[PDB]
Design a protein around this motif. Structure first.
Motif, PDB file in Angstrom:
ATOM      1  N   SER A   1      16.568  26.294   9.475  1.00  0.00           N
ATOM      2  CA  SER A   1      17.434  25.773   8.397  1.00  0.00           C
ATOM      3  C   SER A   1      17.034  26.316   7.032  1.00  0.00           C
ATOM      4  N   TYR A   2      16.198  27.362   6.972  1.00  0.00           N
ATOM      5  CA  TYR A   2      15.691  27.895   5.698  1.00  0.00           C
ATOM      6  C   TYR A   2      15.590  29.418   5.830  1.00  0.00           C
TER       7      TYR A   2
ATOM      8  N   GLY B   1      27.932  39.143   4.400  1.00  0.00           N
ATOM      9  CA  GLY B   1      29.027  38.545   5.178  1.00  0.00           C
ATOM     10  C   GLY B   1      29.964  37.836   4.232  1.00  0.00           C
TER      11      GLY B   1
ATOM     12  N   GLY C   1      27.185  40.506   8.290  1.00  0.00           N
ATOM     13  CA  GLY C   1      26.745  39.107   8.269  1.00  0.00           C
ATOM     14  C   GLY C   1      25.474  38.891   9.065  1.00  0.00           C
ATOM     15  N   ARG C   2      25.482  37.887   9.942  1.00  0.00           N
ATOM     16  CA  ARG C   2      24.242  37.358  10.578  1.00  0.00           C
ATOM     17  C   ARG C   2      23.613  38.404  11.521  1.00  0.00           C
TER      18      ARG C   2
ATOM     19  N   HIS D   1      24.149  31.029  -2.974  1.00  0.00           N
ATOM     20  CA  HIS D   1      23.574  31.355  -1.643  1.00  0.00           C
ATOM     21  C   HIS D   1      23.639  32.862  -1.404  1.00  0.00           C
TER      22      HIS D   1
ATOM     23  N   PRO E   1      20.470  31.062   6.619  1.00  0.00           N
ATOM     24  CA  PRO E   1      20.362  30.362   7.890  1.00  0.00           C
ATOM     25  C   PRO E   1      21.680  30.248   8.644  1.00  0.00           C
TER      26      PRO E   1
ATOM     27  N   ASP F   1      22.825  38.703   3.659  1.00  0.00           N
ATOM     28  CA  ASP F   1      22.324  38.099   4.886  1.00  0.00           C
ATOM     29  C   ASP F   1      20.859  38.460   5.138  1.00  0.00           C
TER      30      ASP F   1
HETATM   31  O1  LIG Z   1      17.975  27.666   2.009  1.00  0.00           O
HETATM   32  C1  LIG Z   1      19.015  26.836   2.434  1.00  0.00           C
HETATM   33  C2  LIG Z   1      20.292  27.461   2.025  1.00  0.00           C
HETATM   34  C3  LIG Z   1      21.412  26.938   2.823  1.00  0.00           C
HETATM   35  C4  LIG Z   1      22.668  27.731   2.726  1.00  0.00           C
HETATM   36  C5  LIG Z   1      23.712  27.021   3.543  1.00  0.00           C
HETATM   37  C6  LIG Z   1      24.822  27.910   4.025  1.00  0.00           C
HETATM   38  N1  LIG Z   1      26.098  27.470   3.513  1.00  0.00           N
HETATM   39  C7  LIG Z   1      27.190  27.491   4.235  1.00  0.00           C
HETATM   40  C8  LIG Z   1      27.531  27.588   5.605  1.00  0.00           C
HETATM   41  N2  LIG Z   1      26.879  27.611   6.754  1.00  0.00           N
HETATM   42  C9  LIG Z   1      27.502  28.029   8.000  1.00  0.00           C
HETATM   43  C10 LIG Z   1      27.229  29.524   8.183  1.00  0.00           C
HETATM   44  O2  LIG Z   1      28.320  30.379   8.465  1.00  0.00           O
HETATM   45  C11 LIG Z   1      29.434  30.424   7.584  1.00  0.00           C
HETATM   46  C12 LIG Z   1      29.613  31.802   6.996  1.00  0.00           C
HETATM   47  O3  LIG Z   1      29.527  32.835   7.995  1.00  0.00           O
HETATM   48  C13 LIG Z   1      29.750  34.101   7.439  1.00  0.00           C
HETATM   49  O4  LIG Z   1      28.905  34.275   6.321  1.00  0.00           O
HETATM   50  C14 LIG Z   1      27.463  34.419   6.607  1.00  0.00           C
HETATM   51  C15 LIG Z   1      26.810  34.857   5.287  1.00  0.00           C
HETATM   52  O5  LIG Z   1      27.191  36.102   4.797  1.00  0.00           O
HETATM   53  C16 LIG Z   1      27.183  35.391   7.742  1.00  0.00           C
HETATM   54  O6  LIG Z   1      25.824  35.227   8.220  1.00  0.00           O
HETATM   55  C17 LIG Z   1      28.078  35.204   8.918  1.00  0.00           C
HETATM   56  O7  LIG Z   1      27.925  36.240   9.902  1.00  0.00           O
HETATM   57  C18 LIG Z   1      29.560  35.183   8.489  1.00  0.00           C
HETATM   58  O8  LIG Z   1      29.929  36.456   7.939  1.00  0.00           O
HETATM   59  C19 LIG Z   1      28.963  27.595   5.258  1.00  0.00           C
HETATM   60  O9  LIG Z   1      30.016  27.639   5.881  1.00  0.00           O
HETATM   61  C20 LIG Z   1      28.592  27.516   3.839  1.00  0.00           C
HETATM   62  O10 LIG Z   1      29.183  27.497   2.768  1.00  0.00           O
END
Ligand SMILES: *OCCCCCCNc1c(NCCOCCO[C@H]2O[C@H](CO)[C@@H](O)[C@H](O)[C@@H]2O)c(=O)c1=O
Ligand SMILES: *OCCCCCCNc1c(NCCOCCO[C@H]2O[C@H](CO)[C@@H](O)[C@H](O)[C@@H]2O)c(=O)c1=O
Ligand SMILES: *OCCCCCCNc1c(NCCOCCO[C@H]2O[C@H](CO)[C@@H](O)[C@H](O)[C@@H]2O)c(=O)c1=O
Ligand SMILES: *OCCCCCCNc1c(NCCOCCO[C@H]2O[C@H](CO)[C@@H](O)[C@H](O)[C@@H]2O)c(=O)c1=O
Ligand code: CA
Ligand code: CA
Ligand code: CA
Ligand code: CA
Ligand code: MN
Ligand code: MN
Ligand code: MN
Ligand code: MN
Lengths: 232, 232, 232, 232
Positions: free
Chosen positions: D21-22, D98, D222-223, D200, D13, D203
Motif C-alpha cells: 500500500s506504499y 499510466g 502503467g503498473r 500522486h 501502489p 509508475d
Molecule cells: O503512498 C500512497 C499513495 C497512494 C496513491 C493511491 C492511488 N490512487 C488511486 C487509485 N488506485 C487504484 C489504482 O489504479 C487506478 C489507475 O490505474 C492506472 O493508473 C496507474 C498509475 O499510472 C497505473 O499503474 C495503472 O496501470 C493504470 O494505468 C485510483 O484509482 C486513484 O486515484
DNA sequence: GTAC
DNA sequence: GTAC
DNA sequence: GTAC
DNA sequence: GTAC
C-alpha cells in the motif's frame, strides 16, 4: 591484543583447537577457531587462487579457493564488520610453518575497497620487488625472489623452513566502514604456490584485516598462522 | 633538499622569479621557475578541475585546467622523469598564501599509476573526513570542513588567511618508474575552489611528486607554494 | 570506403607499398602506407604484447610491442584523430596471410576509452568463448580454440593457412571524441602468438579504429591486412 | 515472451496485483509481482541513487536506494540467476507512466560485470548525448535534453505525460554467467530525478536484465513498468 | 494518501 | 624467392 | 593421512 | 600596490 578478521587457507589439521580432520578454508573472527570452514583439496606444488568478498548490504564474508580444472572450495559467514573492526584498518597476507612446513609463496595480490553515497582504493601486485616500499614486511616475509612474495623462510637450496612466520601489509590504512556510507564493499584476490617435500604440509596462508598497528603475535608460528597470540 | 616535480596553478605573478604577468599554469621540474607556462583565466569563487597525465612512451608531462563553459588552459613539457624522480615517490597537493590570500579548497582528488609488462595503484577521494588516515597532512592543511580538504587556513565564516602553507600526501609510496617496465603511466585529477576578497588572489595550488620523506620547506609560504626552499 | 586508423604489426616487407625491408610496427592513417614505422624483432612462436595509447591533450598515437626479456619496439605519430575519425567508431583486431602465412593468434585483448569533464568504456578478454556475443567476427576469425581468438585460418594440428583474412570488433560503438570534452583518452593492450613454418612469416596483425559499419574490404588478404581496399 | 530480472523503484501502489500500500522497491524475477519488497520514501523532485549488486558465490540480488540525508531503503532476494537468465543478456533501464505520471529522468548510469577464474565489462554514463550509439532506446526514451536520459515522454513545457513507456539498453550483450567461471559478479548504479505536478506520481523506474533481443511488451504502460506483458 |  |  |  |  590486535583485532583480526581473516580468511585462512589451513593446510594442517590441529584437531586439538577445533580444526576439522582435513585441510580446510575458514572464516576467522577474532579467533583462530574458525566460525565456519569448508573442506579444501589443497594441491601440493600447484598455483591456486583465493577470492574474498564482502559488502555492507549483505554483511556476508565469503571466499572461494580454486585450482585450474578442479572444483572450488567456498565458505561464507554472516558478520557485521562494523561491530568487529575499527573504522580504519590495514590489510595483509600472513603465513606460518611449525614442526611441518611448506613454501608460502604469493605470486599476485589485488585489493579494492569502496565507500559509496564514492571513495575508492585499489592496488594490484603481479610483480613483487626487492625493496617494495608500499608493503610492510613483518617476520620472515621477503620480496624479490623470482618477483614473488615469500611469506615464510625458504633456504638457499629452495627448501621451506619450519617454525617460520611472516606477513605483508599494504602501507596505506584502509577506510573499511563509515557510519554515513550507503554501501561499503571490498574484494581481495591472491595467487599462491604451497609446495612441501614432506608427506604433510603446514601450516597455511591467510588474508587478514587488522587494526593499523597490527604486528605478528610473539610465538604465532605453526597453528596460529601469524594472526593470534593463543588458540582461544 | 627534496626532489619536486609539480604542476602549479599559480594565481599570483611573481615577476622576480620569472612568472608571466598573469595567472598561469606551469610545469616545475626541481625549481619554482617553471620550465613551461600557459596563461590561465582563474575564475574567483568557481569550482575548477585539473587533469595531469604522463607516460614513459611519450615522456611528456601534460596538464589541463578547466571551468564549466570556459576554454581550458593546457601546458606540456618533454621530460624523462626516470632521470628526475627517485623510483619510489609520494604524491600530493600543496598550496600557499603570503601577503595576498585565497581559499585553497580541494573538493575531490584521484590518482592512478600503472607499471606494465602489471602493477597498479588507484585512489579516489570525493569526500575528505576529519581523521583521514590514508592522508599525511602537513602545515596548515585540514580535512572534514564540508567534506573538503582546506590546504591553507580559512576562518569559521570561510575567509582565507595570509602567510599560510599546507599540503596533503597520499600515505602509500608510489612506484613511479621501474627499469624493466615496458610502459609506466600516471594520471591525477582534482577539483578546487579558489576564492578571494582581494583584487589579487595568491598564491596557488600544485599537484606534486616528491621523495617519499618530503616535508614543507622552511619559509615556503607565498610564491614558493609549499614546494621549494628558495626561488633558484 | 571505410575510415581506418591502425597500429600494424607487419611481419612481411612489401617494398612496393613502402614497407621497410624488415618486420616493422607502423601507424596507418587511412592508408596501408604507414605514416611512421619502427623496426620490429618479431620472435616466431613466442607470445608478444602490444600497447596502444592516445590522448586529446598530446594528440599523439603511440605503440609499444614487446616480448619477455627482449628490447621493445615503439612508434609514435602526431595526429589529431578529431579530424580523422568519426565521433563514434568501432574498435577491432585484424590479421591476414597471403602467399606466406603465420598463426594470428590473440590470447588477450583489453580496451579503455574515457571522455572527461566523465564517460567511460572498458572491456577485458582474457578468455575467448565459442559463441562470444560481444564480438563481431568477420572473415576467417574464430573463437574458442584453447580460449584464444584465431584471426586467420589454422588447421586442426595448429598449422596456419595462406590467403586468409579475419577481424574481431567489439560489439558496442565507442565515443572516441566529443567537441565539449576537456580530455579524451584511449588505450588498448593485446597479447598475440605469431608462429610460421615459413622462412618468411606473413602478413601481420593490426589494432584498428573504424567507422561503426566497417567490414573487411574486398580482396584485402596479404599485404592489406584486412583494413584497406588498395595500397594507395 | 522475454525473460526479465529487475529491480523496481515502484512509485505507485497497484494493490490489485500484489504491490504493498506504499511506494516500494522490489526484486522482480520473471513477474511484476515482486518476490521481495521494502518500503521506499520516494522524495518528489529530489535526485536519488540506486545501487544493485549480485555475485555467484552468495547468489543474492540486493539493491539500495537513497537520497542525501535520508535513511536508505534496501531489498535482497536469494536467487541463482544461472537458472533464470540466459548466459548472454542485455542490461537496461525502464520506466512507465499510466493514468498518473512523473518524470523518469536518468542523470547517470554505470554497470560492471566480471567473470573470474578474468573477463570484464564496464561502462559509465555521466552525460547522455542526442545520438548516443552505445544505447538502444525503445519506446518514448530520449537522450540529450540537459545531458539526461528521459525514459518517458516529457512535453515541451517540461510536464511528464501519462500512458508513456520507454527503455534504454546498453548496446553490447553481457556475459552474465559461465559454467566454468569460479566467480561472476555485477553491479549497477544510477541516479534519477522523479518529479510529479499531481498529488500522486506513477509508475516507477527499473534496472533490468533480459534476453538480448528484449523489446517493450505491447501495452506495458502503467503498473507493468515497460517490463511484462501482463500482471501474472 | 486521503476521503467517504 | 624469382624476375629483370 | 595412515598406521597401530 | 609601492618604490625607483
Ligand atoms: O503512498 C500512497 C499513495 C497512494 C496513491 C493511491 C492511488 N490512487 C488511486 C487509485 N488506485 C487504484 C489504482 O489504479 C487506478 C489507475 O490505474 C492506472 O493508473 C496507474 C498509475 O499510472 C497505473 O499503474 C495503472 O496501470 C493504470 O494505468 C485510483 O484509482 C486513484 O486515484
Ligand atoms: O589431510 C590429512 C593430513 C593429516 C596430517 C596429520 C598430522 N600429523 C601429525 C600430528 N598431528 C598432531 C598435530 O600437532 C603436532 C605438531 O604440532 C606442531 O606442528 C604443526 C605443523 O607445523 C603446527 O600446527 C603446530 O602449531 C606445532 O608447531 C603429529 O604429531 C603428526 O605427525
Ligand atoms: O593593489 C593590490 C593589487 C596589486 C598587487 C601587486 C601585484 N603586482 C606584482 C608584484 N608585486 C611584488 C610581489 O611581492 C609582493 C608581496 O609578496 C608577498 O606576497 C605574495 C602574495 O601572497 C607572495 O607571492 C610573496 O611570496 C610574498 O609573501 C609582482 O611581482 C607583480 O607582477
Ligand atoms: O624464399 C622465400 C623467402 C623470401 C620471400 C621474398 C620476400 N622478399 C620481398 C618481396 N617479395 C614480393 C612480395 O610479393 C610476393 C608475394 O605476395 C603475396 O604474398 C605476400 C605475403 O603473404 C602478401 O603480402 C601479398 O599481398 C601477396 O599475397 C618484397 O617486396 C620483399 O622485400
Ligand atoms: Ca591448522
Ligand atoms: Ca606566483
Ligand atoms: Ca607488409
Ligand atoms: Ca506499482
Ligand atoms: Mn583451521
Ligand atoms: Mn609561477
Ligand atoms: Mn607495413
Ligand atoms: Mn511493485
Amino acid at each position: 591484543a590486535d583485532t583480526i578478521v581473516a580468511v585462512e587457507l589451513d593446510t594442517y589439521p590441529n584437531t586439538d583447537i577445533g580444526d576439522p580432520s582435513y585441510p580446510h578454508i575458514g572464516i576467522d573472527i577474532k579467533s583462530v577457531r574458525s566460525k565456519k570452514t569448508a573442506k579444501w583439496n589443497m594441491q601440493n606444488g600447484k598455483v591456486g587462487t583465493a577470492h574474498i568478498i564482502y559488502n555492507s548490504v549483505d554483511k556476508r564474508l565469503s571466499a572461494v579457493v580454486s585450482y585450474p580444472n578442479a572444483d572450488s572450495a567456498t565458505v561464507s559467514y554472516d558478520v557485521d564488520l562494523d561491530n568487529v573492526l575499527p573504522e580504519w584498518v590495514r590489510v595483509g597476507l600472513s603465513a606460518s610453518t611449525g614442526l611441518y612446513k611448506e613454501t608460502n609463496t604469493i605470486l599476485s595480490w589485488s585489493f579494492t575497497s569502496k565507500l559509496k553515497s564514492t571513495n575508492a582504493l585499489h592496488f594490484m601486485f603481479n610483480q613483487f620487488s626487492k625493496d617494495q616500499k608500499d608493503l610492510i614486511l613483518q617476520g620472515d616475509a621477503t620480496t624479490g625472489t623470482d618477483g614473488n612474495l615469500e611469506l615464510t623462510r625458504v633456504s638457499s637450496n629452495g627448501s621451506p623452513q619450519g617454525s617460520s612466520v611472516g606477513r605483508a601489509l599494504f602501507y596505506a590504512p584502509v577506510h573499511i566502514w563509515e557510519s554515513s556510507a550507503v554501501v561499503a564493499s571490498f574484494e581481495a584476490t591472491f595467487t599462491f604456490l604451497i609446495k612441501s617435500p614432506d608427506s604433510h604440509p603446514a601450516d597455511g596462508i591467510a588474508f587478514f584485516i587488522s587494526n593499523i598497528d597490527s604486528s605478528i603475535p610473539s610465538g604465532s608460528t605453526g597453528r596460529l598462522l601469524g594472526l593470534f597470540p593463543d588458540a582461544n
